[PDB]
Design a protein around this ligand. Structure first.
Ligand SMILES: *[C@@H]1O[C@H](CO)[C@@H](O[C@@H]2O[C@H](CO)[C@@H](O[C@@H]3O[C@H](CO[C@H]4O[C@H](CO)[C@@H](O)[C@H](O[C@H]5O[C@H](CO)[C@@H](O)[C@H](O)[C@@H]5O[C@H]5O[C@H](CO)[C@@H](O)[C@H](O)[C@@H]5O)[C@@H]4O)[C@@H](O)[C@H](O[C@H]4O[C@H](CO)[C@@H](O)[C@H](O)[C@@H]4O[C@H]4O[C@H](CO)[C@@H](O)[C@H](O)[C@@H]4O)[C@@H]3O)[C@H](O)[C@H]2NC(C)=O)[C@H](O)[C@H]1NC(C)=O
Ligand SMILES: CC(C)(C)C(=O)Nc1cc(C#N)ccc1COC(=O)N1C[C@@H]2CN(C(=O)c3ccc4[nH]nnc4c3)C[C@H]2C1
Ligand SMILES: CC(C)(C)C(=O)Nc1cc(C#N)ccc1COC(=O)N1C[C@@H]2CN(C(=O)c3ccc4[nH]nnc4c3)C[C@H]2C1
Ligand SMILES: [Ca+2]
Ligand SMILES: [K+]
Ligand code: NA
Ligand SMILES: [Zn+2]
Length: 802
């Protein structure tokens, strides 16, 4: 470490060791040159020009300069021009639209500066507005969302690395603020050097995507000791490098307001200061850019990782209050719980009994236990060996801790984060400002997984495969690199006619249906042939994006895509107008299941299988309850409308079909509903192939769904009915887990009106989540632009307050 940093402070291109370093990571590696702080971390005279300093003789020891050569040397204090040249601060200037990039010669593309702020809760934009004039100018003049949804867990590393990669934590591998990997036999902590081993960090983050494609990056790590002022001056110096050396993408990171927020709560009186400070740093950057003539050239993204909630020690739940075998578990504690065996050499560890002991045990309990595969699918928090089989979702405002000793042998804090990512307090911020973003534009809330695609667009890069839906944020941008196209249908449907006689079927099924007009039979003929298909299929048939064998089946009240491989529909589509009336399954038709004369015995389910199977009953995708007439109801009992359902789950499903659909049709002015099965036995969030199914209705080839979905669409303008909508659509969807019990809902021994809807809300989902899980592609035929449809497909209905 004997070498010098002279003239190589914060050098971008790296050197070969044991040879001393001068970059942000050097303190962490103990590899800094002995003159690092002296040369690279000057502080003399502070950060601002004062009037007396103007035009001075250059003293190389000052932190920044007011000397005449400073603009060209690229190292003035950010307020130099204001003080020494009578320029105005960036914030005081009117905002003027940036129609085209106004860049100095040599700039091949507008730079991107990612200004990331830790714990910057969405509502600070309104609530701290009086003290954040620079940020508020960015926000009102550029493009902003009311809030941006983080990913689960709403911790710092999982979310910054999601921003950088477009990946769910389960895919990028940073699934928590601390992690045990069972194959590394290693722990990853906020403290320590293990976290610096590359083996934890999957996917391809923006700085690597940028390099691999010939675009240079400034640092995406800043030392905690390096003050924010020196961080801004470093970015400003790099922006003054020669064309061949100068990076195109930059990052800034603020520890605030998160650092304070943990101490004082999200709205503690001590929070106003951190917000003033962040604002001042933004002011410095914008003043700096304006000096360099870059303030109408650079795209600036102001983005937070997660919000902040009120959490205190006395609001902790202790596992020792639930389990007696509390010493046989390791818990990752806090705003989420992850339990594994304290030792794998122990074959006396039983997760089922742990779960059981943690379920609805206290009238008011503030967490809920889940096997990871049972977590709401919208959290995408299962497909990683680092995520423990046992998970606890903790209520907002609470903590889980193992024993009382852990909170008083380790009250300090008033704020925390990490809860479910639909929680209002966890929402964070997005503002984009620059030539490539729109002018004075509000966009709807979106998920942070979408940004990697946009940052690649902004930089002319081709994104690595990721979890955003590329095009879903084209409406943020003035000019678009990416023009999305609908994927091609892989399998085209069959359209079978009447090909089988009743007596050919031997399904163990029975129906009371043999009751004694010519016009009446041509009417019904037109039905089985797609007459009301434009009423029940409002957005075109979904496209199957994989290779398979399936039949389109028309009926009076509904239309389906019936899979000959899975022996049940992939999808069933139907419209319930506001006027539509509910009826009951008449008594003689309770056990009614009818063969479908369009589909072979061999590609049909049978009732026998359901008899012999003591666990499994069955339900219907189009609900009998909602048939338009007594004759049409017979359609609802076709064996091709049937699906396997646990009796426990039928309680949920029956309430949704009998009560909730009609309610939605009344509130929304008609709804269109597409429901179907989902198979995700390997919990990867993607459609299972046949050979992945772990469970069949006993002694049959009838596969059992892990989940059931519905997509419920209507007109955004609810003065128009769902079936005659001229403009933007409105959607909400869910993916309900197909479970043999209702342990998840503590009050399920009450009437369905007390719990079912609360459960469905918990399992709300994006249409895009259902697409991954089914291999289907929806909304193929609408009057809407494809970009708008992508936005709709990424929409999540969250059921939170405002
Ligand atoms: C969100 O977006 C992401 C990104 O697009 C989606 O994830 C992708 O999904 C693909 C499908 O699951 C998957 O493709 C597979 O890749 C296998 C090789 O994987 C390596 O290479 C890639 C490319 O560089 C790399 O990204 C991978 O990185 C993973 O693994 C390491 C750890 O080992 C981590 O550093 C990293 O975080 C990442 O981990 C994640 O992925 C793995 C699985 O890949 C998970 O297990 C982890 O939990 C974690 O989430 C890897 O370095 C490739 O071998 C596969 O090919 C198999 O299948 C094809 C079918 O086409 C077939 O030709 C072969 O038979 C082959 O099977 C053989 O191997 C089997 C497995 O051992 C064996 O059982 C068989 O018998 C066969 O011998 C496959 O193509 C892709 O890797 C990931 N990418 C990422 C970044 O995660 C994700 O699905 C999206 N999510 C949603 C909800 O939509
Ligand atoms: C992997 C990495 C470097 C974190 C990353 O992706 N960074 C990235 C991507 C983009 C983007 N896109 C934009 C900016 C960046 C900026 O990163 C950085 O300089 N750092 C962020 C780390 C946060 N941190 C903590 O110790 C911490 C831990 C637990 C906490 N709870 N509550 N507050 C916490 C703070 C050290 C800071 C170093
Ligand atoms: C630069 C980057 C990748 C954004 C980063 O710092 N990421 C990050 C932030 C935090 C934190 N906090 C925690 C973990 C991570 C992820 O780590 C990684 O994947 N890597 C970082 C290692 C740095 N490195 C070097 O050879 C090196 C470079 C510069 C040096 N100066 N002095 N000694 C040095 C040694 C190989 C990189 C692999
Ligand atoms: Ca799957
Ligand atoms: K049964
Ligand atoms: Na229950
Ligand atoms: Zn924090």
């Amino acid at each position: 470490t004997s070498g010098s940093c002279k003239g190589r402070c914060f050098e971008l291109q790296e050197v070969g060791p044991p040879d001393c370093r001068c970059d942000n990571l050097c303190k962490s590696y103990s590899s800094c040159c002995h003159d690092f702080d002296e040369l690279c971390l000057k502080t003399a005279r502070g950060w601002e020009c004062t009037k007396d300093r103007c035009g001075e003789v250059r003293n190389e020891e000052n932190a920044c300069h007011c000397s005449e050569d400073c603009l060209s040397r690229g190292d003035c204090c950010t307020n130099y021009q204001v003080v020494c040249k009578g320029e105005s601060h960036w914030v005081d200037d009117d905002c003027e639209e940036i129609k085209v990039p106004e860049c100095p010669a040599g700039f091949v593309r507008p730079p991107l500066i990612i200004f990331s702020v830790d714990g910057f809760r969405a509502s600070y934009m309104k609530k701290g507005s009086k003290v954040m004039p620079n940020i508020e100018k960015l926000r009102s003049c550029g493009t902003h969302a009311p809030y941006m949804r983080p990913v689960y867990p709403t911790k710092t590393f999982p979310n910054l690395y999601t921003l950088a990669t477009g990946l769910y934590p389960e895919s990028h591998g940073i699934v928590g603020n601390s992690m045990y990997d069972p194959v590394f036999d290693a722990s990853f902590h906020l403290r320590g050097r293990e976290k610096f081993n590359h083996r934890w960090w999957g996917g391809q983050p923006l700085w690597i995507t940028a390099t691999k494609q010939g675009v240079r990056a400034g640092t995406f790590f800043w030392s905690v000791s390096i003050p924010h002022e020196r961080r801004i001056l470093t970015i400003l110096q790099w922006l003054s490098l020669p064309d061949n050396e100068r990076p195109s993408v930059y990052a800034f990171y603020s520890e605030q307001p998160d650092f304070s927020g943990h101490k004082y709560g999200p709205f503690g009186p001590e929070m106003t200061n951190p917000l003033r400070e962040i604002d001042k740093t933004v002011g410095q950057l914008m003043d700096g850019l304006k000096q360099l003539r870059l303030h109408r050239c650079v795209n600036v993204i102001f983005v937070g990782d997660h919000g902040m909630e009120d959490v205190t020690c006395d609001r902790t739940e202790f596992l020792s209050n639930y389990l007696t075998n509390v010493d046989d578990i390791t818990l990752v504690p806090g705003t989420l719980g992850r339990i594994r065996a304290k030792s794998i050499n122990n074959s006396k560890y039983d997760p089922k009994t742990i779960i059981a002991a943690l379920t609805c045990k206290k009238p008011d309990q503030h967490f809920k236990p889940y096997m990871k595969q049972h977590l709401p699918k919208r959290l995408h928090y299962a497909n990683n060996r680092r995520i423990e089989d046992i998970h606890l979702l903790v209520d907002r405002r609470w903590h889980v801790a193992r024993k009382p000793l852990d909170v008083y042998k380790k009250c300090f804090f008033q704020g925390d984060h990490g809860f479910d990512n639909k929680v209002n307090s966890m929402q964070t911020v997005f503002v984009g400002y620059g030539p490539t973003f729109k002018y004075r534009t509000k966009v709807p809330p979106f998920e942070n997984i979408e940004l990697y695609n946009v940052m690649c667009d902004l930089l002319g890069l081709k994104p690595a495969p990721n979890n955003g839906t590329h095009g879903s944020l084209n409406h943020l941008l003035r000019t678009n690199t990416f023009r999305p196209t609908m994927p091609d249908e892989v399998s085209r449907p069959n359209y079978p006619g009447i090909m089988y006689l009743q007596s050919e079927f031997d399904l163990g099924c029975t129906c009371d249906d043999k009751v004694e007009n010519k016009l009446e039979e041509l009417n019904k003929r037109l039905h089985t042939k797609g007459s009301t298909k434009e009423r029940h299929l409002l957005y075109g048939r979904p496209a199957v994006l994989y290779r398979t064998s399936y039949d389109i089946l028309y009926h009076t009240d509904f239309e389906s895509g019936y899979s000959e491989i899975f022996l049940m529909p992939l999808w069933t589509s139907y419209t319930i107008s506001k006027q539509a009336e509910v009826s009951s399954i008449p008594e003689h038709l309770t056990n009614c299941v009818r063969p479908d004369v369009r589909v072979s015995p061999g590609f049909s389910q049978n009732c026998l299988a359901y008899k012999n199977d003591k666990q499994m009953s069955y339900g219907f995708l189009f609900p009998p309850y909602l048939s338009s007439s007594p004759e049409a109801k017979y359609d609802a009992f076709l064996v091709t409308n049937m699906v396997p359902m646990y009796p426990a789950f039928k309680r949920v499903w029956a309430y949704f079909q009998r009560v909730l659909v009609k309610k939605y049709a009344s509130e929304r002015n008609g709804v269109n509903v597409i429901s179907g099965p989902i198979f995700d036995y390997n919990y990867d969030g993607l459609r299972d192939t046949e050979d992945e199914i772990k469970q069949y209705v006993e002694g049959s080839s009838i596969p059992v769904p892990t989940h059931y979905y519905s997509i419920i669409t209507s007109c955004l303008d609810f003065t128009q009915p769902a079936d005659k909508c001229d403009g933007p659509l409105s959607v909400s969807s869910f993916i309900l887990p197909h479970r043999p019990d209702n342990d998840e809902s503590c009050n399920s021994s009450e009437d369905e009106s007390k719990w079912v809807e609360e459960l469905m809300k918990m399992h709300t989902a994006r249409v895009r989540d259902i697409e991954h899980l089914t291999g289907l592609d929806f909304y193929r035929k609408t009057s809407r632009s494809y970009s708008e449809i992508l936005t709709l497909k990424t929409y999540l209905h969250t059921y939170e307050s405002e």
